[PDB]
Design a protein around this ligand. Sequence first.
Ligand SMILES: Nc1ncnc2c1ncn2[C@@H]1O[C@H](COP(=O)(O)OP(=O)(O)O)[C@@H](O)[C@H]1O
Ligand SMILES: Nc1ncnc2c1ncn2[C@@H]1O[C@H](COP(=O)(O)OP(=O)(O)O)[C@@H](O)[C@H]1O
Ligand SMILES: [Zn+2]
Ligand SMILES: [Zn+2]
Lengths: 192, 174, 171, 613, 434
Amino acid sequence: SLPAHLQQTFSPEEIQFIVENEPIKIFPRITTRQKIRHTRWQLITTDDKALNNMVAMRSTEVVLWIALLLKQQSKCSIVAPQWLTTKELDRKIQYEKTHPDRFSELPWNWLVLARILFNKAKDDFHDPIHELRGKIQDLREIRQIKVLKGLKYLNESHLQLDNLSLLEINELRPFITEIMDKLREIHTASLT
Amino acid sequence: TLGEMNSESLEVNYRHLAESKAILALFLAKCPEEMLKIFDLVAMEATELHYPDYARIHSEIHVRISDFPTIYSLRELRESNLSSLVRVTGVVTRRTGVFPQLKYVKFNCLKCGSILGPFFQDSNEEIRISFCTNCKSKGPFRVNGEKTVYRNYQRVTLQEAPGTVPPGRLPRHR
Amino acid sequence: GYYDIDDVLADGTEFPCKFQYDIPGLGYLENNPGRPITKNTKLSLPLWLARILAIVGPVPFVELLPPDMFSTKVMNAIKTDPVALDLHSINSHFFSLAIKWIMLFSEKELANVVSELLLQRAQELNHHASSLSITNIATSTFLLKLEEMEKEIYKKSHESYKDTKRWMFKK
Amino acid sequence: DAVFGDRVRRFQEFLDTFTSYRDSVRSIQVYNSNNAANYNILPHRIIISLDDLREFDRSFWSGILVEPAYFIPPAEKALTDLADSMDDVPHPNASAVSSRHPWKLSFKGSFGAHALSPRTLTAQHLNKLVSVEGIVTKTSLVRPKLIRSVHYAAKTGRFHYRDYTDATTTLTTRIPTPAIYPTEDTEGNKLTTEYGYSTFIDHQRITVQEMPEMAPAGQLPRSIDVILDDDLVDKTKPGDRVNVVGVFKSLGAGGMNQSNSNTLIGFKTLILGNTVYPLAARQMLTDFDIRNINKLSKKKDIFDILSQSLAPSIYGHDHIKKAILLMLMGGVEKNLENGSHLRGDINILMVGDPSTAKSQLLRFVLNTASLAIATTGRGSSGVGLTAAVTTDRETGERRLEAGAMVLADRGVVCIDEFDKMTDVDRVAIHEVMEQQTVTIAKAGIHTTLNARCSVIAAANPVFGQYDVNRDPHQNIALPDSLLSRFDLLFVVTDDINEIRDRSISEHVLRTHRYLPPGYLEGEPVRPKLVTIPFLRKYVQYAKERVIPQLTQEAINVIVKNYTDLRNDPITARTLETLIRLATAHAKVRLSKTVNKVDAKVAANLLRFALLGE
Amino acid sequence: NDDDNTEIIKSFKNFILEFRLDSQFIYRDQLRNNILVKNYSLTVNMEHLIGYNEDIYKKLSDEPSDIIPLFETAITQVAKRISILSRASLPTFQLILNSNANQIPLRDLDSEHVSKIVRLSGIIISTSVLSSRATYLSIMCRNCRHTTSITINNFNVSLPRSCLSNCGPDPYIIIHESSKFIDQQFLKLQEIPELVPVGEMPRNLTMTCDRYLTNKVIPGTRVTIVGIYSIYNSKNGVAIRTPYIKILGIQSDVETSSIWNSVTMFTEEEEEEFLQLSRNPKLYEILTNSIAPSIFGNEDIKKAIVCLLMGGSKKILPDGMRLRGDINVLLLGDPGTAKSQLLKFVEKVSPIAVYTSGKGSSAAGLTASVQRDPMTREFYLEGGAMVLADGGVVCIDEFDKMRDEDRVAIHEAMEQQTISIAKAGITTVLNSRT
Ligand SMILES: Nc1ncnc2c1ncn2[C@@H]1O[C@H](COP(=O)(O)OP(=O)(O)O)[C@@H](O)[C@H]1O
Ligand SMILES: Nc1ncnc2c1ncn2[C@@H]1O[C@H](COP(=O)(O)OP(=O)(O)O)[C@@H](O)[C@H]1O
Ligand SMILES: [Zn+2]
Ligand SMILES: [Zn+2]
């Protein structure tokens, strides 16, 4: 029933769905607030109290599919997180270049959220998009170098990483799982 | 029609110089190199009077003198015809490929800061560098890329035509 | 696995072996009609016979000789340069046969050799799978030197990288 | 140096770990001492396995296979120290003390990516140890080279030696010595050179060309020039399918001088050959192979088994394949006291219709012979078949290079389209068939060259199709004088049939339905029958081991059959031809005597060849 | 001047790192995927460099020989930034250009285009042997025994006269142990026969390739080449310095897979389209109508032509029996049946194909010939028309008229698929699968 390319791993659009199902800070451009003198929102998979209390030009916290849906309307503009600034990305780049053995303390959804906000929020960034995408590509490349260095330690027992992103888990999942499964199969056949 | 397909050759009939200003035809017959060295500048000014800013297309113009009234074969060339215009009938047997040649040769003296001045190539023998403009001795010389001009060069072996030679004799090669 | 078709072709390969008993009536093993098998007969049989013919038999019925695919020459060639070795010309399913030989004959040195070989060609497999053209000779000659399970792993990794490339790079 | 000494003790530890090399050095030394001093000399070389050094030190193994200039001379120094410490000889010679060749290294084992070909030798493999495979071509003459000069001073009475270094001799780069002998000493006044104590090595240049079967589409085979060290000199003849292991090195200024300012020429690249492998033309014979050979020799139809074992894909021509079998194991040669050279090499001319698989039998006897050289009617010259005189590059001297017909000595020549030689090539070929030696008198050179080789040739008639009118003149377009030197003139007719034609049709459709083992279905290619390496071992065993002699019970049959064949295109040479068959069948039986069963088979085969039976 | 050089290096570094089209850094990904397969090269489109900055385009196109090594240094700096972690090797790269410019013909190449990037087209007739040029040289002084290093870029330098410690006049030698080398392949280019001038001959022009551009073309292909038109002095009148072209880029749709290795370099969507064509229920009629659309009739001839173009399968037997995997077709008939037009169309359609005559042929011309090298005075075999058509199609026009000694040198080349030549002291069996 399940397709062969969705058998033992997630597709990247399922990762997009998973990271669309998080809260995010946002600026409404419409007023749905009841004054002292309109059907309610009434959702069942997220808290609708922050969406019922939606005030124009304020900071609220809504789920990301609502964020993208309202950005398509341009009724509400998505605010980038703290780590999507040039200074914080430069700090992450310096941490990557400082400790070669350890990955930086980036969020798990740092590639997928960046792609979503680049392709959907082209006028919602205080810093320019240009150097932001340059630093995103630099962090992606240095994380690729670190996972290429760490792949020399493919052990039969176990293998650990600290702060690898979910999209990088789907980058490296079938290769690592198949190679370690066959290494374990070789050693378990080697046991008496 | 020089400007029409961006040609650089301006044909001049020698009979036109014979009809009007025959002193100019005599000066061209006696001293052809300096006369053409004036004539190319004259033809370039005459082109720029009709086609302004033509120097961007072709920096130098050239003139092909046509119909010299005296035709000399290769057997009849003597010492009196040197440094003069000759009209020679012959067949081309050997043609070499196109070769780039330095129109102006310039070199860098290694020991001195001064550079050697650009000298025009006569396409017969190389320019003999006896000394430098700052040091009166020979030194290492190599071509600078500051001002380089390249022109096409090709030798042909002009054998005399076998219908033109006396019957049974040998041809001549120039 | 029962239904693994790669395992079915792995069991279909023939191994050299020696007959230990004088067994009449099995002349169709060596394509003869009716020849009884003499004592100490050298013959190539498929693995689905000789895997448990060496078990049942004390002296078992069939002795499994060391084949050319596990010889000292092949072991030394693997130990020298694991990357540019052409495993496809040796056997198309060398690794599954290696796993079955290790499970049958518990050899520790062969286990270390095949583990080290799998690690070194897995590095090069990952290097060729992560490369997406916007095919080179240096990758396709290595695809010419790959096994069926190894090109299966390469296909999984390469379609994973290509699908996430088109997801990240366009809608 | 310190790192040099460190690699010296590392290789000393390696030689201490594996004591087989010490035993081999001891065996070489005691063999040299027994065969030299006391009432054919083993040289200074050892067989180093890369695999045995790989489990010891992988750093030294990578140093040998990657940067061998800093790793092979320390191993040379360590091996020389071990050979000096192992040797315990009293009262040595002065030439033995002064001139000692250091113990060179010869390498075996798997190479991986470094095992290469002359086409794929490229600039990334320079200064690396590589193994190449290819045809030997253009062997330079053996010429000595001075590496150490020993001089004597009589005013002081002292011997001064000077070491001489070359780019090819030393893997490391030293300041080159201009090869001028020292005229005088700085303190010893006049110096006299003492030849005999000076050290000279043999120098030879060969050219390894790529094997032409591995050439790609549209490209000519490439070549490299390989220097041969003095132990390996004269191991290789042209046409040898050699495997050379050596350091791929580049030398010379190579246009980097100030005179060559903008010349785009490259550097001269060579291989300093560490070892040379034949790659087994004379295969070694294990005792199991000898047991198989002597077991199958006792069978009554070993001639039939070895006949249909030759080319099972070819249907028919069974007597022709029997003659091919007797051609590969050619008969005994007898050299008389007065000097008459009696030919023991049977030669076969096959004339007939197109698509009777004569050229396919030529290809089969090309592949399955120990030494085989092919040639074609319009692709041969008479000078190009025997020998051609040319200059040599490293000598500046004129010399011969052997052609096709001389390089196949003690082998076979596979001539295709023999009916259409140029007459110049016909003169040279007829000269070899009547003389077996070629006389070259040109370029100031008066030389004779031996060619004791067999000839199998294929030809068409002068018409498009062979006539059944049995005309003697329309068999071949060649003269009958060249027909006379051929022992077996087989003629084949592609007569049009139904049943036998269906048999040949089903046989070639069974031939096309073959799939080579270990290859995928539908992909491009990248009653007892013995195997063809076993057949080659049988042929080699019969060739070197047994020399048959001739006995009367074949002789009465032979003279009766000759009288029957002649008195009832016949030549007296046919008698010798029967001998060239008969003892050849003795080489099938491996007996040193010839019996009646050889002579009857000889008479039957010659009656098939002439009359058609 | 080094400030301008490092400004150029930094600017082209910023061109690599900062180029982005449709949310994609194409050149950083190209460099990463080129490093990951150990293909140390970067292919740059000229349109992209113009769209980034036209000032950089004039800096490239004005004096290319003095700035292409600076761009090489910038590419190696980007590569060491990308694939090497700092404070926790890679050789020099190669910049390969792609241009969509109008093709300058060989006869119009003259002194105006000296030291300028030109794009041309032609036919390869000869590829030489690979020669080992040097990049890194460990230069040793013979007297004071100190070792310096000279870095060589292969554009437009020799051994210097001072040892840089009297020490000696020319005290330098070269240590070959610690020297790095790259490849260099010489090519000879013949111009396109459709674009030759009137009444003249096609002029052969000598060209050079370095590093990964070597061994990319078989002789006989039709290729478009972008590269600089530089001048080198030759050992062979006055001021004659012979011209050549240093190749920066090779493109050829007719030629595939460089030297043939039976390798699958076709792209994946083109492979799927080709699979769709192989799944077509009437591809036979499509291939029949594809051959000679302007020739009426001759349907069986077109089917035989398609069978010739696809060919059979070469088989190998354990006894060495080699059987033919190609078919040879002879069209015998009246004039006006458009047989030679079918020959010309077969030469156009086939990837490897040559067109020959019967009158204009020779025995050493169709098969391989034995020629003499001028400098070494040694004989060598140069391939003929059936060597240039190896793995492909040879077409013969007026086969009835070629000489009786000339027809019969082809028998082994048609049937045995090999040419066995024993001439002038050279004996060999070349393969000719034609
Ligand atoms: N069993 C067979 N019987 C007859 N002919 C065969 C058989 N097998 C192969 N052949 C054909 O013999 C041909 C080779 O003979 P050919 O090339 O005509 O020899 P030559 O070149 O000496 O005339 C091949 O084309 C092959 O098709
Ligand atoms: N069926 C056809 N369709 C189009 N043109 C044709 C056809 N038949 C003949 N021709 C024309 O007639 C000429 C025939 O020449 P061709 O027969 O090829 O020369 P040859 O006799 O040497 O083979 C060609 O130039 C072609 O243009
Ligand atoms: Zn000066
Ligand atoms: Zn010095």
